[PDB]
């Protein structure tokens, strides 16, 4: 449960039993033959794994420095890496005898992933979403309803993700006997940061095999955007023990790191307890990003740990830099990236320029940008 | 050139030279080691091929008849099978020495595919689109702009696909030395119906290998929606010589086959010549080519490819129609039952497969070609 000084399980007594049951079940099923057979089957035939590792030749040439490879999580069913975790936990829930999935969502992106996985496995899905977030994400709300999920507006407090988390926990306290609480990032009380990282680690394992096939060596740098940190942990984790592989997490710089309108929790946040974990949060202060998925005010404890021991570096990219990268990748490689992923692309482009032509950067392209076309059209 | 009595090359002499050069180049490159290596490289690393073949267990159980498999073209980069052809022709153009791609588009979906492939290969892209169609498909026009393509609105004439086609041909006659004309379906003059089918046949080759792996046998039926007919030919073609495999093409029935608002060219159209091909086109009582309709933008096309006209004539494939209402029902059904939001085009095939499955036994197998995803269609489904 602890990653050095970060993590834990800060919950009321009522949720300790449920979490220990989940930990027990996960330990059983994670190395189980039948679980892994079913999980790999759904990831292959329904989600479309493995995703390719793409050499961005034109982007590489335009910048004129290091080779830029893109791990194409944008091609997974649903258009985002969140699907890997949604399938994993929903299958875990089903084999535990649960009939219902609950989740919170701010962007609606984890909400959609959870709705898809619940539909696949024949489970009831209730999604908690702050009323203010419901207004910003009309199409994702519609997606969730098309997929058969019930969207429950949360009208308490600030009516944002923070409040949706509180309602979801209050729900789970009462309903855990038949309901799995499906957390969407490497956040929350133990065992969730570990479970979500484990279900996203497939990204890094594929990426390692694929870059060894393409280039005969591990990358010099891996760059991934960081909200709560799940896509980053997924691609980072299999390279953590490869000492020479640099790991860079890119948070939302928003309107600037000194503007008070960003989501750079590791960069500017304070250490404290929220959502059942000890990690960095902005201070309780609301975050901002043009990329909806980068608007969680905290960050996963395993990233806080990797920063502490200096195994990974954490940086920020502004809204304008992300928008620039969104347009650049679209026009140069014919890939419209998610605005979240465009933060990683933006930093990778800055970093590639300073590196030599024989060096290698892998960017985790965490999602596709179809969802963001209205925001980009306006911005 | 011909598929039985259908197809041909019904063009002016200005286009015969360009088409002859394309035919020569294609004949040389189609079995070439280097071309196919590059094509497969882009299809794998950029487009994400192979797409999976998915057993829709919940949908199968709900209907209570045949096993329903979905060939997941919705997972290709761009979300539609059109990418397979766009890459193939754009790469062909690059190895021919062309620096520019042109295309027409009605729904903007081929425009997007062409724009993506052109961006990939560093080629200039100009997309002709009727001004009425530009108004209908603003987000696809924006997608094309983001991808670096120049959308040329055609304001002359009726301001629709027919005018965009004429502008594109007019352009190609002048610029064929450095420009490739990228047709998006199994339509147009020879060699386009053959080329497009060949670049989409990867769908069927994968599907055949995958169904043999999954079930140890060929499917009883393959169901695919039919606009111009490229996704259907792609999945059909490798099974044509497998005589036991039934092939069903699903056209847009629109508001109904007797309503005057559909795109069922094979069912209710007559023979005609347009866009350089002899095939079926929707026609009125006076013999004039009449407009089509479908809720699915990609099926809203009054013609059909000549190879489908041939397969219909020899009775190798059966052609049916599904209404707007039935397609919408299938769109919703697949979304909530399997967690897959299909393209409205593809939902026509799902709709027919659900009817057919009900009248078949549980040991039998249907493959549905799920030609695309429905993210693009969410606005029009929300309103409807
Ligand atoms: Na794949
Ligand atoms: Na954050
Ligand atoms: Na038609």
Curated annotation (Swiss-Prot), chain B:
It catalyses: (1S,2R)-1-C-(indol-3-yl)glycerol 3-phosphate + L-serine = D-glyceraldehyde 3-phosphate + L-tryptophan + H2O. It is an enzyme of class 4 (lyase). Its cofactor is pyridoxal 5'-phosphate. Pathway: Amino-acid biosynthesis; L-tryptophan biosynthesis; L-tryptophan from chorismate: step 5/5. The keyword Lyase applies. The keyword Lyase applies. GO terms for cellular component: cytoplasm. The modification N6-(pyridoxal phosphate)lysine is found at residue 82. One of its GO terms (molecular function) is tryptophan synthase activity. Signal peptide: none annotated. Tetramer of two alpha and two beta chains. Belongs to the TrpB family. NCBIfam families: trpB (TIGR00263). This is Tryptophan synthase beta chain 1. It comes from Pyrococcus furiosus (strain ATCC 43587 / DSM 3638 / JCM 8422 / Vc1).
């Amino acid at each position: 449960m602890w990653f050095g000084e970060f993590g834990g399980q800060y919950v009321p007594e009522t949720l300790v039993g449920p979490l220990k049951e989940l930990e027990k079940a996960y330990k059983r099923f994670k190395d189980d033959e039948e679980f892994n057979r079913q999980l790999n089957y759904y990831l292959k035939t329904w989600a479309g794994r493995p995703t390719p590792l793409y050499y961005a030749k034109r982007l590489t040439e335009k910048i004129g420095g290091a080779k830029v490879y893109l791990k194409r999580e944008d091609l997974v069913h649903g258009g985002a890496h969140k699907t890997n975790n949604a399938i994993g936990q929903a299958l875990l829930a089903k084999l535990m005898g649960k009939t219902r999935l609950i989740a919170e969502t701010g962007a609606g992106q984890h909400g959609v992933a959870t709705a898809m996985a619940g539909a696949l496995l024949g489970m009831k899905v209730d999604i908690y979403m702050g009323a203010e977030d419901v207004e910003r994400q009309k199409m994702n709300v519609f997606r969730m309803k098309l997929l058969g999920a019930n969207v429950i507006p949360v009208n308490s407090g600030s009516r944002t993700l923070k409040d949706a988390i509180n309602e979801a926990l209050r729900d789970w306290v009462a309903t855990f006997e038949y309901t799995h609480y499906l957390i969407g990032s490497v956040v929350g009380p133990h065992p969730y940061p570990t479970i979500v990282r484990d279900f996203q680690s497939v990204i890094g394992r594929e990426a390692k095999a694929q870059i060894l096939e393409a280039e005969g060596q591990l990358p010099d740098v891996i760059v991934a955007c960081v909200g709560g940190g799940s896509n980053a942990m997924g691609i980072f984790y299999p390279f953590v023990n490869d000492k020479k592989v640099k790991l860079v997490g890119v948070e939302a710089g928003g309107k600037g790191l000194e503007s008070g309108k960003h989501s750079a929790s590791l960069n500017a946040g304070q250490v404290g307890v929220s959502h059942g974990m000890l990690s960095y949060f902005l201070q309780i202060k609301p975050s901002h990003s043009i990329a909806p998925g980068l608007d969680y005010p905290g960050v996963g404890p395993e990233h806080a740990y990797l920063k502490k021991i200096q195994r990974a570096e954490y940086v920020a990219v502004t809204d304008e830099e992300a928008l620039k990268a969104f347009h650049e990748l679209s026009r140069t490689e014919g890939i419209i990236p998610a605005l979240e992923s465009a933060h990683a692309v933006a930093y990778a482009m800055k970093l590639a320029k300073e590196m030599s032509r024989d060096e290698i950067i892998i960017v985790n392209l965490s999602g596709r940008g179809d969802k963001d076309l209205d925001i980009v059209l306006k911005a």
